[PDB]
Design a protein around this nucleic acid. Structure first.
Ligand SMILES: [Mg+2]
Ligand SMILES: [Mg+2]
Ligand SMILES: [Mg+2]
Ligand SMILES: [Mg+2]
Ligand SMILES: [Mg+2]
Ligand SMILES: [Mg+2]
Ligand SMILES: [Mg+2]
Ligand SMILES: [Mg+2]
Ligand SMILES: [Mg+2]
Ligand SMILES: [Mg+2]
Ligand SMILES: [Mg+2]
Ligand SMILES: [Mg+2]
Ligand SMILES: [Mg+2]
Ligand SMILES: [Mg+2]
Ligand SMILES: [Mg+2]
Ligand SMILES: [Mg+2]
Ligand SMILES: [Mg+2]
Ligand SMILES: [Mg+2]
Ligand SMILES: [Mg+2]
Ligand SMILES: [Mg+2]
Ligand SMILES: [Mg+2]
Ligand SMILES: [Mg+2]
Ligand SMILES: [Mg+2]
Ligand SMILES: [Mg+2]
Ligand SMILES: [Mg+2]
Ligand SMILES: [Mg+2]
Ligand SMILES: [Mg+2]
Ligand SMILES: [Mg+2]
Ligand SMILES: [Mg+2]
Ligand SMILES: [Mg+2]
Ligand SMILES: [Zn+2]
Lengths: 100, 115, 127, 211, 224, 83, 131, 100
RNA sequence: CCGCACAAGCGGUGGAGCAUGUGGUUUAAUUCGAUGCAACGCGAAGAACCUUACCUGGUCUUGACAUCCACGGAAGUUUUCAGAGAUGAGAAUGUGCCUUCGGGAACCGUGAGACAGGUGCUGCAUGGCUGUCGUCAGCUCGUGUUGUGAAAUGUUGGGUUAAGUCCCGCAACGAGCGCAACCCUUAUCCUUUGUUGCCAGCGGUCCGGCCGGGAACUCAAAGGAGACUGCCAGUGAUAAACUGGAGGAAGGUGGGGAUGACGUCAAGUCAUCAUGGCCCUUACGACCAGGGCUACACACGUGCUACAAUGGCGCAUACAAAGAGAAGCGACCUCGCGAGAGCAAGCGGACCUCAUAAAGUGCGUCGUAGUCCGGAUUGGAGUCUGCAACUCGACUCCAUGAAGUCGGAAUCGCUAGUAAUCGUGGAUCAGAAUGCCACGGUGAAUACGUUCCCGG
RNA sequence: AAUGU
RNA sequence: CCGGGCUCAUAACCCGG
């Protein structure tokens, strides 16, 4: 994963963190059943205005170590390529081959 | 019995013989039989003409058969006049709601022919 | 006195609390016929008594749990056989010779890497 | 045929998990990451130490670290001077009070990793690899009275075509679970390309399992 | 030993006539019925002088070795050796026993070691299967090494029941220049023997005469 | 499609551009990229140059297409027959 | 198997009667382990045959089986190094097995409306030895 | 009456046995009534990733984590008992929870 | 001599439709990689945007990413205008912190270079990791040997195994790596700890282990016993071995798992990562919006649902296993034909939720048919996530009802709790399981045997 | 079935 | 004639239109 990839990701996450409350509040507004049509309309209009990356979805759960954008484990924050090694160093505490 | 136009429901259980009416799926059939207060099971036979006639009235409320298709054609012609993605694939005999065109398209494209 | 035995088949467990009685059959506080939809399992479970032809003289207070209809039936039988010889030793020789006594051990396979099933494999491509 | 890691096979009873702290799923990934960061920092600090192994510990909301090296003094520092230089930053990355512990390796020839690191160093210093393997296995057989296996792989001798070679002495029942093998590997930089190393040291047919 | 003793001992018997064995037409009294007849009159001097040499050998502290693979003398060889505490091979001559004594020493070590553990009895610590295996193995070793384990080194001379049945041992020993005292029967070759007793090599009585005279001589010379 | 509760969608810059154009009576074709923009009645009788990944395709708004996208009338791919 | 000999697997006798033969019939007839339905069908066709012909369900069934049991086979075996279609004798167990398999094939091919019906008619044919 | 309840989590059954030993003895000496630690069913999490880089797609290997559980409850515990339990500190691999 | 290599069984592929992968063709672009077996539901454990490496346009040139110098400002917060956006232009704003009192640390901007940057090349320069023979029973060394030597011998021959397993004979003697074993799981019995788990026997109960009680029973997890050819027979060279019998929960490797002996394919991976060496520096680097990765005359691979009475449809009613839950899982109650909406308890979870298993079974109905079969396609209209479902999402209702009635040549798999058949979970993950990995329930036939295959 | 790295 | 089969190929032969 090229450095530029990672720069993008870090910037994205930081910025997404920035606007979290604003966006959640406006979402609450928009979804509200009884809310004024005009207020809903204005809220929707404004939401466009926020930075596109702000949305949490645009992220990608890359492997922490290699940053490989596939075979990622949340339980470990790493690509599959690494967990085998780290597991077999016995460093992963209590991690052992499963033979049941 | 002749019903809902020149259609003849065969003498099977009233509900299904009634589904025989094009534009009438099982839902509508069950609905009509309920409305008439007529046991769905009954054959088309053994019904006093008046029951048949109230059924005729009932089906009257539908959009059915020739007008149904007429509307379908109007919708599709309307769609076809547009020049959009959907209309173009409609006029090209191609999947229109987004299935792969590489393979598995016979029912729309038709039997395989040589290249 | 109280006579007890435990039974296990497939993945099922059965408690057989059984006492000198009248042969009444209580399974989960239910009639045997109400328990198993067909006599089949009833036929199967009754057999151990059948050998002794002493089918009439115990009171059966019974549990079975887990697995399915058939494994459960088998567990019921196993527990009954044990609890019976557990009740009386001297019957044991005829019981084992009569082939009642063993415990079945067969069980299932796990699904495995590269297999759709225990012993089935994807299509091979002919070459 | 390609092999399974000796440590992994022996990990369940014979080989200790270099880490054994507890965590929920919640902390787990970052606990691992902190262990990774610290150890890499430690390795640079401990490279002179050439410590055989490092365990990271998380007693009571606080971390702890133990290090095994060939020389206690090198890693520690006079009057315990340098150790604290490490303790500062390790407590920092750990985000928690940290403390260092040092266990001396008493027979460095008997450490797979140490042997490998030495071999690799000499390789990078253009010592003939074959001589290196010879003398290393020599020491090992002299001292341990127990089998040893060794291997090297790469553009041996700077040849235009790569190859690998290995050497064995004594018993090395890798297959047996009871047998315990000190396994490790290493890296030996080359003016052209890369050279790898791997080691297996049998020490004694265990009786008594993990205990 | 009288010649009459040799005749009574059947020393004069002969092997069936053999094609292309004309090496020894001389030194035979005669032949008939495919029985070659040995010249015992030669035996008396050859025998007595072999004993004369052996007496000195034993007086040297000479380590004799007795090799027997003709089963009829397997017991006798051991008995004569043990009569002078000398070493013996009643068993097969597994080969290499001299030429790679370098190798054999290790086997000697392991025999000693298993003996030591038997005296420890620590086999019982192991699984019964393994312990019975250990006993089996130790016996298997003792079956052959028992008659030689004690010498600690190469003997001083070989005694051969039959230049033929003991062939391989002679072949080996010649490489070291070890003297060979051997019985040569008709259809058997002295070519490899140092000291020879002309006599039948497949009669127990002849074996007995040889071995008795030999053992008496070795005992006296050893005991001076 | 979009939940009814959610209401319609149009891209704000585009809405501003169209409101301004209609007010001015400028009536020149509108460059855009907002395919996702939904067609509204107020934009009837107007013209829009919809980007298609390569080029902005001219399109004449009419009541019929109201409620459609703008990208629906600006094909992206191409195909002229294998043979 | 190539190397060495093997036996065969034992199965339950039917609780209703105890005719292992019937056990094998239900087994060979069963599909997808649906033994309950199979035995239901078997009993139905059994009765509707015996009670329309013969004295006793089991006895009628047996004699019917008999009436079709073969004795010889031709399936080739490479005894002479080639695929000779040498006719050799058939094992009584194998005789029964083939009989059952055949009769069930016939009932399968007999018709659409009742499996129980098809079967009973097949076995009526067998007992009468014109089928 | 006052009820104190204790649960324990770690990756090694033996370790947890010994910890409990400490937990019970320390409460026994102090004289509080002690409930013998109650064994409980353990969880085991399982995983597997492709063990091979690039194209070869078979050979994923699996691993498992087993987390053992033990529970102790104290009734009418002595205050000294309570603080004594508080005094005990468990090994780093051990995780402890206490509740009243 | 051996093993799904044939034979005897069971049931599929190959035709129908669709899903998915791939060849070709096409396009501005349809990013790159994997190839008989051993590529082709493969990398990818999840392409709307991001992802994303390509196309198109708009942009930057010490730079998106790091240090180093100088220089200027706390940081940051709120907000307007242009632009599709990237960006540009402004406004107020902050106005701080440690300060030895010098400033410094903070951060931020600009300038100077040194450098930064590559998913750019080479798997035939490499390391690491992986496929393949093949869980195939083999593979070698020391000493010795004898042979002039080149060597072979060991490792062959006689019995016996799953096996270089073992016995016996034996110029060879002995050793190591494979084999077996030490490990998990699974089967019978015991000790020990009893809530959130247990209820045989007590007492009460609205009958709800509901609660009093109970530690029996089941069960939970730690530690123990348990199978050895040990026993009887027989047989065999007394050998080893083999056949039967008892005993026993379990009998001869009880079953299953892991574990892959030396090495072959200059097999694959420079795109996880590492790197020799080699190419590019206002660009082969970087930023922005939309487009593509899903096209569509054709060929191929893997699969899902089928062509029906063992079945179709309606009503009622039995019995499982294992997993996952804190921005989580989410009850009860209300709203809706429905996808869902609203309100909100509990549970970090033997306690609460996901979440009522489906096959089975009582009653009824359907009468062989393009069907009450099959279900695609198409129209209309809805729910949800998401900034945002035009290209291109899943899901709900009405209506529409293809092909298809067992499928050539040819070909795949399986020996028991297996095949087949029927449900459950989890991971990647906002949203997207006919793929992938586990879990139960129900549950068989066949095996003469080694002659033709096939690879050893 | 002939020729083929 | 074309397209599918047969091989590790390219033929022979084989299948489908
Ligand atoms: Mg995403
Ligand atoms: Mg319909
Ligand atoms: Mg009661
Ligand atoms: Mg329940
Ligand atoms: Mg696959
Ligand atoms: Mg299943
Ligand atoms: Mg493996
Ligand atoms: Mg076959
Ligand atoms: Mg390549
Ligand atoms: Mg603007
Ligand atoms: Mg600058
Ligand atoms: Mg290669
Ligand atoms: Mg190549
Ligand atoms: Mg050899
Ligand atoms: Mg084998
Ligand atoms: Mg108790
Ligand atoms: Mg004999
Ligand atoms: Mg015997
Ligand atoms: Mg027995
Ligand atoms: Mg055994
Ligand atoms: Mg093994
Ligand atoms: Mg973009
Ligand atoms: Mg693609
Ligand atoms: Mg239907
Ligand atoms: Mg969900
Ligand atoms: Mg049709
Ligand atoms: Mg719609
Ligand atoms: Mg199915
Ligand atoms: Mg599923
Ligand atoms: Mg999930
Ligand atoms: Zn003689």
């Amino acid at each position: 994963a090229k450095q530029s990839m990672k720069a993008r990701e870090v910037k994205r996450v930081a910025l997404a963190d920035k606007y979290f409350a604003k966006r959640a509040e406006l979402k609450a507004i928009i979804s509200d059943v009884n809310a004024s049509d005009e207020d809903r309309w204005n809220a929707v209009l404004k939401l466009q205005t926020l930075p596109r990356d702000s949305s949490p979805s645009r992220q990608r759960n890359r492997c922490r170590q290699t940053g490989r954008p596939h075979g990622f484990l949340r339980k470990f924050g790493l690509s599959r390529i690494k967990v085998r090694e780290a597991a077999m160093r016995g460093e992963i505490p209590g991690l052992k081959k499963a033979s049941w | 019995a002749r019903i809902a136009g020149i259609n003849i429901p065969d003498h099977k259980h009233a509900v299904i013989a009634l589904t025989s009416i094009y534009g009438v799926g099982k839902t509508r059939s069950k609905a009509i039989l309920a409305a008439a207060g007529i046991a769905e099971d009954v054959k088309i036979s053994e019904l006093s003409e008046g029951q048949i006639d109230t059924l005729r009235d009932e089906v009257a409320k539908f959009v059915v058969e020739g007008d149904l298709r007429r509307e379908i054609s109007m919708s599709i012609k309307r769609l076809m006049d547009l020049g959009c993605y959907r209309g173009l694939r409609h006029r090209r005999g191609l999947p229109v709601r987004g299935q792969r065109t590489k393979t598995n398209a016979r029912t729309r494209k038709g039997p395989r022919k040589p290249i | 006195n109280q006579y007890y035995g435990t039974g296990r088949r497939k993945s099922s467990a059965a408690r057989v609390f059984i006492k000198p009685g009248n042969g009444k059959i209580v399974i989960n506080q239910r009639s045997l016929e109400q328990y198993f939809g067909r006599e089949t399992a009833r036929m199967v479970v009754r057999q151990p008594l059948e050998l002794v032809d002493m089918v009439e003289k115990l009171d059966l207070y019974i549990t079975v749990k887990g697995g399915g209809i058939s494994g459960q039936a088998g567990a019921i039988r196993h527990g009954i056989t044990r609890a019976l010889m557990e009740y009386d030793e001297s019957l044991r020789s005829e019981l084992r010779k009569a082939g009642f006594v063993t415990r079945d051990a067969r069980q299932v396979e796990r699904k495995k890497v590269g297999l759709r099933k225990a012993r089935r494999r994807p299509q091979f491509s002919k070459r | 045929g390609q092999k399974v890691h000796p440590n992994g096979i022996r990990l369940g009873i014979v080989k200790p998990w270099n880490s054994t702290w507890f965590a929920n799923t919640k902390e787990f990934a970052d606990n691992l990451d902190s262990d990774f960061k610290v150890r890499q920092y430690l390795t640079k600090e401990l490279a002179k130490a050439s410590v055989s192994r490092i365990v990271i510990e998380r007693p009571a909301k606080s971390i702890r670290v133990t290090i095994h090296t060939a020389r206690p003094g090198i890693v520690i520092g006079k009057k315990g001077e340098d150790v604290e230089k490490l303790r500062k930053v390790v407590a920092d990355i750990a985000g928690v009070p940290a403390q260092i512990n040092i266990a001396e390796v008493r027979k460095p020839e008997l450490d797979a990793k140490l042997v490998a690191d030495s071999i690799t160093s000499q390789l990078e210093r253009r010592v003939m690899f074959r001589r290196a393997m010879k003398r290393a296995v020599q020491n090992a057989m002299r001292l341990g009275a127990k089998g040893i296996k060794v291997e090297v792989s790469g553009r041996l001798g700077g040849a235009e075509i790569a190859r690998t070679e290995w050497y064995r002495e004594g018993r090395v029942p890798l297959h047996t679970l009871r047998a315990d093998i000190d396994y490790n590997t290493s890296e030996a930089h080359t003016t052209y390309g890369v050279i790898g190393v791997k080691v297996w040291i049998f020490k004694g047919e265990i009786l008594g399992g993990m205990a | 030993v009288s010649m009459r003793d040799m005749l009574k001992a059947g020393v004069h018997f002969g092997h069936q006539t053999r094609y292309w064995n004309p090496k020894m037409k001389p030194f035979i009294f005669g032949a008939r019925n495919k029985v070659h007849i040995i010249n015992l009159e030669k035996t008396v001097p050859m025998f007595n002088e072999a004993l004369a040499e052996l007496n000195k050998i034993a007086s040297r502290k000479g380590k004799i070795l007795f090799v027997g693979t003709k089963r009829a003398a397997s017991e006798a060889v051991k008995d004569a050796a043990l009569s002078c505490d000398q070493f013996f091979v009643n068993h097969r001559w597994l080969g290499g026993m001299l030429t790679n004594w370098k190798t054999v020493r290790q086997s000697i070590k392991r025999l000693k070691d298993l003996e030591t553990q038997s005296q420890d009895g620590t086999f019982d610590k192991l699984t019964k299967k393994e312990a019975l295996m250990r006993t089996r193995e130790l016996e298997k070793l003792e079956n052959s090494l028992g008659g030689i384990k004690d010498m600690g080194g190469l003997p001083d001379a070989l005694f051969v029941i039959d230049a033929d049945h003991e062939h391989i041992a002679i072949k080996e020993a010649n490489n070291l220049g070890i003297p060979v005292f051997a019985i040569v029967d008709t259809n058997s070759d002295p070519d490899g023997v140092d000291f020879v007793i002309p006599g039948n090599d497949d009669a127990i009585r002849a074996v007995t005469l040889y071995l008795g005279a030999v053992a008496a001589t070795v005992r006296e010379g050893r005991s001076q | 499609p979009r939940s009814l509760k959610k209401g319609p969608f149009i891209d704000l810059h585009l809405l501003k551009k169209v409101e301004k154009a209609v007010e001015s009576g400028d009536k020149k074709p509108l460059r855009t990229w907002s395919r996702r923009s939904t067609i509204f009645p107020n934009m009837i009788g107007l013209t829009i140059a919809v980007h298609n990944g390569r080029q902005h395709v001219p399109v004449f708004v009419t009541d019929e297409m109201v409620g459609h996208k703008l990208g629906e009338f600006a094909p992206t791919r191409t195909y002229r027959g294998h043979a | 198997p190539r190397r060495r000999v093997i036996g065969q697997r034992k199965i339950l006798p039917d609780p209703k009667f105890g005719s292992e033969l019937l056990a094998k019939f239900v087994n060979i007839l069963m599909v997808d382990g649906k033994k309950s339905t199979a035995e239901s069908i078997v009993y139905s066709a059994l009765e509707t045959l015996a009670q329309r012909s013969g004295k006793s369900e089991l006895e009628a069934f047996e004699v019917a089986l008999e009436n079709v049991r073969p004795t010889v086979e031709v399936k080739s075996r490479r005894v002479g190094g080639s695929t000779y279609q040498v006719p050799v004798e058939v094992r009584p167990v194998r005789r029964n097995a083939l009989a059952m398999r055949w009769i069930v094939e016939a009932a399968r091919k007999r018709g659409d409306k009742s499996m129980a019906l098809r079967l009973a008619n097949e076995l009526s044919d067998a007992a009468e030895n014109k089928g | 009456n006052q009820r104190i309840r204790i649960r324990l989590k770690a990756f090694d059954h033996r370790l947890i046995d010994q910890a409990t030993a400490e937990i019970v003895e320390t409460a026994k000496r102090t004289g509080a009534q002690v409930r013998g630690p109650i064994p409980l069913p353990t969880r085991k999490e399982r995983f597997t990733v492709l063990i091979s880089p690039h194209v070869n797609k078979d050979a994923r290997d699996q691993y498992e984590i087993r987390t053992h559980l033990r529970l102790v409850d104290i009734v009418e515990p002595t205050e000294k008992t309570v603080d004594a339990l508080m005094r005990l500190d468990l090994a780093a691999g051990v995780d402890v929870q206490i509740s009243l």
